[PDB]
Amino acid sequence: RGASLQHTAPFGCQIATNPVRAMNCAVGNMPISIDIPDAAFTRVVDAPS
Amino acid sequence: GQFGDIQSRTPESEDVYANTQLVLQRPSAGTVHVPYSQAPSGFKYWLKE
């Protein structure tokens, strides 16, 4: 039988199955692009000194 | 887990130097069962060793 992908997790990996899932796939980068509303950012006069 | 986990400061003494790692576990599922994990007999291990 042997150890499964959870039992044999390289990469610091979290093995998931049915469906296969990289829970804690410890690798790489994630590009997060937040186009937020700019009116959330109060201006240079909007802040205290 | 030490050989001498129950320390009798007197031979029929009233004090017991004992840190057995008796950790209470989660409750019994719908039935009154004491979920409580402890270390084994350290003098029973001293009986074993």
Partner: protein, 338 residues
């Protein structure tokens, strides 16, 4: 309705482990001891029709087999299975028998007959349990980890169940040859008496009544009863019909396996003295524990060990880290403290 035991016919089989070194035509033929039970429910095939009354109906205290060309009905209590210990009987439906028996390499099926006829069914039954969790624990646990596993349940209804029954070859009988003394004065008893007489002229006949032969000895007449009254579970250990081809039926079967769960143990994780990149975990396992260390990054070096006594694993923990899956619990984390 479901008169499948009425459709059943008790037929004994020449088993090899019958007791005293002699296996014979007993009603206790272990046909196919299925080890498909993922949780540990053994599905054995029995030579009797277990759970069958004398009229083919339910015998709620009775066990059914074929005794002496008739139904061999007995008590349902005495039919036991000794694999290595007194086995936990699950169910008796037809040939199908449910076993929560002990672990072993052999299996005898010892059934107490009506005249105390303890028929043995001896074979190698390598009863070995499958592993749940990391701990080598045998018992049925009080609390612990949920393992969704198999279980060879005793579903007696034949949903995908099909036993190959058939009218077998002719049941031989030494009483069918009658004392005609040099005549063939064969008594029938109402059976399909295929008598091959060893004398002149008509030394044949699938007779239905008693005959009288001239010039043919009683040792010449080989008589047998026509085994064509019911479908019997046509396994290889039974004498199949050489007078039949493939004319055989398939009836519902017992013992349907299903998916169940199990409770496993998670033992007390020992103290971990943390020194420089190395934590000594003084674990005291009470079952044979699977403790695994894995690297926290790409190069895992996936070590695993089975524990019998207490031991202090000096885990040289990486800077990437170490996953320590001991017991049945979640694996411990090792990040090196700066």
């Amino acid at each position: 309705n479901f008169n499948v035991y009425k459709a059943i016919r008790p037929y004994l089989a020449h088993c090899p482990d019958c007791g005293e070194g002699h296996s014979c035509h007993s009603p206790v033929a272990l046909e196919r001891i299925r080890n498909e039970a993922t949780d540990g429910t053994l599905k054995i095939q029995v030579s009797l029709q277990i759970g069958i009354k004398t009229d083919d109906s339910h015998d709620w205290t009775k066990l059914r087999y074929m005794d002496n060309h008739m139904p061999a009905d007995a008590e349902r209590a005495r039919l036991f299975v000794r694999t290595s210990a007194p086995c936990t009987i699950t169910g008796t439906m037809g040939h199908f028998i449910l076993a929560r028996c002990p672990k072993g390499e052999t299996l005898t099926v010892g059934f107490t007959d009506s005249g105390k006829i303890s028929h043995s069914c001896t074979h190698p039954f390598h009863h070995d349990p499958p592993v749940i969790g990391r701990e080598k624990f045998h018992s049925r646990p009080q609390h612990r980890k949920e393992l969704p596993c198999s279980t060879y349940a005793q579903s007696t209804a034949a949903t995908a169940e099909e036993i190959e029954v058939h009218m077998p070859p002719d049941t031989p009988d030494r009483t069918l040859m009658s004392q005609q003394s040099g005549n063939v004065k064969i008594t029938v008893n109402s059976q399909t008496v295929r008598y091959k007489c060893n004398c002149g002229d008509s030394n044949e006949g699938l007779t239905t009544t008693d005959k009288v032969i001239n010039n043919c000895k009683v040792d010449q007449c080989h008589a047998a009863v026509t085994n064509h009254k019911k479908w019997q579970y046509n396994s290889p250990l039974v004498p199949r019909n050489a007078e039949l081809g493939d004319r055989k039926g398939k009836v519902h079967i017992p013992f349907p396996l299903a998916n169940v769960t199990c409770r496993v143990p998670k033992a007390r994780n020992p103290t971990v003295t943390y020194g420089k990149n190395q934590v000594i975990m003084l674990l005291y396992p009470d079952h044979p524990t699977l403790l695994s260390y894995r690297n926290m990054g790409e190069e895992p070096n996936y070590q695993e060990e089975w524990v019998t006594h207490k031991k202090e694993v000096i885990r040289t923990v990486p800077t990437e880290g170490l996953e320590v899956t001991w017991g049945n619990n979640e694996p411990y984390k090792y990040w090196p403290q700066l």
